[PDB]
């Protein structure tokens, strides 16, 4: 925050609240869109009933949800069962704040973000650990071990790739030289589109985000069809809704973060209207990810650990040292345009034999 202003604490608050409830309506309507987009992929139709577009069905659903009877299991730790859903949502919502959707002053006088800070990615990392805390904790809190085991599979896997995200994030930091999202973005304004320079790390970041419930590992798990996922399976009315809510906000936070960092989110080469583009990129990754949600198999997490731990993460720190070598010896930043382009040429061509 060398170059960027601060709105008064009341306005920071108000913006925070707007972003939270905005994220509420966001998650619900996103559930509708994925329902139907999936329906198109599998050549059926969505829910038009309880319409008009079918888009009043989160009202109906939320309405079921509350008035549903929130059940607290005995044989569940009384304090932890309640507290668990609380944690998972709190640490999910926060840190979508940081993401700038526009230049300063452009919020109608103020600030497209909520908070910016000076240490950016670390905040994200920090908040990311704590949701997982919520996961394995709920697994305990429920005090059904069937729930536990799954929560443990979950946590082990998540934590694995969660490590992956860091060594992913190292490379682009070298180039920009800042821990701030606005600076990274602006770096992409001038030198342009970090994934041009950073590509392998782009790959390992994205796929690292597969672990965080994104689908294609999925021995996350959802309880479905396996040794269950754990955390949900013991909760009913509001609390269950809270867990689902958190996992989805994380999904869109990631769909925002991917353009924000490696691409130029907002801050596109041309047109450069402030909000619309970040929402569009969000939409792009969101849709592509939904395709991923539908159209690919599971890992078992035996493999998922193999894939992230054995493949993604070593690959991640390998590229870091390369970009470290390049930035340390100051050569040009061109060598990374060339290198990333070339590595992309490799990591693609070996698919089509």
């Amino acid at each position: 925050t060398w170059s960027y202003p601060v709105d008064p604490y009341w306005m920071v608050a108000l913006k925070a609240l707007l972003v939270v409830v905005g994220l509420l309506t966001a998650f619900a309507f996103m559930t509708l869109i994925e329902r139907r987009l999936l329906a198109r992929f599998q050549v059926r139709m969505g829910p038009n009933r309880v319409g008009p577009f079918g888009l009043l069905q989160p009202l109906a659903d939320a309405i079921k949800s509350i008035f549903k009877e929130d059940i607290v299991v005995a044989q569940a730790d009384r304090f932890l069962f309640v507290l668990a859903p609380l944690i998972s949502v709190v640490f999910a919502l926060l840190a979508f704040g940081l993401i700038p959707f526009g230049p300063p002053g452009s919020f109608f006088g103020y600030q497209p973000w909520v908070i910016n800070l000076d240490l950016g990615i670390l905040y994200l990392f920090a908040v990311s650990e704590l949701a997982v805390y919520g996961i394995f904790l709920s697994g305990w809190a429920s005090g059904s071990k069937y729930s536990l085991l799954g929560s443990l599979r979950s946590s082990a896997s998540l934590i694995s790739y969660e490590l992956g995200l860091g060594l992913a994030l190292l490379a682009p930091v070298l180039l920009v030289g800042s821990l701030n999202l606005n600076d990274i973005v602006n770096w992409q304004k001038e030198h342009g589109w970090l994934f041009l320079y950073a590509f392998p790390a782009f790959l390992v970041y994205l796929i690292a985000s597969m672990a965080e419930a994104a689908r294609t590992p999925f021995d996350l798990p959802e309880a479905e069809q396996e040794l269950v996922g754990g955390y949900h399976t013991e909760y009913s009315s509001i609390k269950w809704a809270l867990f689902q809510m958190a996992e989805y906000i994380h999904f869109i936070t990631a769909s925002a973060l991917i353009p924000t960092l490696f691409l130029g989110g907002w801050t596109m080469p041309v047109l450069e209207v402030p909000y619309l583009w970040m929402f569009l990129k969000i939409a792009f990754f969101l849709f592509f990810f939904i395709w991923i949600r539908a159209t690919w198999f599971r890992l078992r997490y035996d493999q998922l650990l193999r894939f992230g731990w054995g493949f993604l993460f070593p690959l991640a720190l390998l590229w870091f040292l390369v970009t470290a070598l390049v930035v340390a010896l100051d050569l040009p930043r061109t060598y990374l345009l060339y290198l990333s382009a070339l590595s992309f040429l490799v990591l693609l061509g070996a698919v089509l034999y």
Binding site: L38, F41, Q42, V43, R44, Y146, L149, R215, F218, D219, P221, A223, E224, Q225, E226, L227, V228, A294, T295, W296, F297, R298, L299, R300, Y301, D302, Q303
Partner: protein, 384 residues
């Protein structure tokens, strides 16, 4: 950890209960527990006319029902010495194979979902819907169709069945390939299914695993070939096979079986010319409905047939048939009564299951789900 995978939950399919003796992420031994669907046909059917039973036959294996229909019809016809007309036989091969395509479509739909992901249940469902529409067209029912008769079949095929069977016979080759397209080149599935699910032929034989999950481990035994019945003896017929029995190979074998089934459909469809449809022996077959207004003998026989039914000779009988789940057949003891003395049904799905504590022994846990779907059970057949 003796983990208790429940009766109906969590997505252990078709109401089975499993005591997975399991410490860690492997599987020590699963101690299977069945009997949750036990309806008790073998007793109930001792209390129904041989005609009446034909309503109870489709109802066990409800996916490939007509294999039940066929097996039972045959064993009785044999036992009372009835002569089934050629066009009826042809229709019975068509329906049997169409019902097979239905069943198989279901098996791989559920399999792909069970571990792995959601999408392809739907396309298989689309083709299955075209098949079910075929069945509705001819029998007036989706399944449990009361059609086959000890003589032959209930009535003839309507004008509209032929055109529609072709439509599906046209899309299916392209279609079956599309399912195959996704699978044979298995992206994750290969690293998911190739290793899992060990089937030695010798133990398959030792534990008696007959049902097309047998040929996936390299034993060549098909009832339509080994012990021919309904004129499968006369068809251009390919039997798909597997290399070493895993999940993957079982899974593809049945897909090949679908195009070969379709080839039997086309082939039988070619050989079909007009005629009558069931054995006219009045002892066996209720009179023509039109002359109930004219003949004494007609009315007497109508009344009698639909009340008492008929009495087959004192004797025991059995005939083997091929379902999409393996060897199926009815062991019929008749006492010369209007109702069978006893009907024991050889349940393929029941013997096939002695090899699951074997099959999923040492396998993964996420895989322990997949390894179940890959064995293709139907519980109506099992419990029974």
């Amino acid at each position: 950890m003796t983990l208790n995978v429940g009766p109906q939950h969590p997505s252990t399919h078709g109401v089975l209960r499993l005591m997975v003796t399991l410490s860690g992420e492997e599987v020590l031994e699963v101690v299977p527990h069945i009997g949750y669907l036990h309806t008790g046909f073998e007793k109930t059917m001792e209390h129904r006319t041989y005609l009446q039973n034909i309503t109870y036959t489709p109802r066990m294996d409800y996916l490939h029902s007509f294999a039940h229909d066929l097996a039972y019809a045959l064993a009785v016809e044999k036992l009372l010495g009835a002569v089934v007309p050629p066009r009826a036989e042809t229709i019975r091969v068509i329906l049997n194979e169409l019902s097979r395509l239905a069943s198989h479509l279901v098996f791989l739909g559920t399999g792909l979902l069970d571990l792995g992901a959601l999408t392809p249940f739907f396309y298989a469902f689309r083709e299955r819907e075209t098949i079910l529409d075929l069945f509705e067209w001819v029998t007036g029912q989706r399944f449990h169709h009361n059609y086959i008769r000890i003589g032959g079949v209930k009535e003839d095929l309507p004008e509209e069945f032929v055109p529609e069977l072709k439509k599906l016979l046209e899309v299916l080759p392209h279609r079956i390939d599309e399912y195959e397209a996704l699978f044979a080149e298995s992206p994750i599935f290969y690293e998911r299914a190739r290793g899992v699910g060990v089937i030695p032929p010798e133990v398959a034989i030792d534990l008696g695993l007959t049902g097309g999950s047998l040929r996936a481990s390299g034993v060549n035994y098909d009832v339509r070939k080994a012990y021919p019945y309904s004129g499968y003896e006369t068809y251009t017929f390919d039997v798909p096979l597997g290399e070493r029995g895993d999940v993957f190979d079982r899974m593809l074998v049945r897909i090949r079986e679908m195009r070969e089934s379709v080839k039997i459909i086309k082939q039988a469809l070619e050989r079909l010319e007009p005629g009558p449809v069931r054995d006219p022996n009045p002892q066996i077959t209720p009179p023509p409905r039109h002359l109930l207004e004219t003949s004494m003998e007609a009315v007497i026989y109508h009344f009698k047939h639909y009340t008492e039914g008929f009495h087959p000779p004192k004797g025991e009988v059995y005939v083997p048939t091929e379902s999409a789940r393996g060897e199926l057949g009815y062991y019929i003891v008749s006492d010369g009564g209007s109702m069978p003395y006893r009907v024991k049904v050889r349940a393929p799905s029941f013997v096939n299951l002695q090899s699951l504590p074997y099959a999923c022994k040492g396998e993964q846990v996420p895989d322990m789900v997949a390894i179940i779907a890959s064995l293709d059970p139907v519980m109506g057949d099992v419990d029974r």
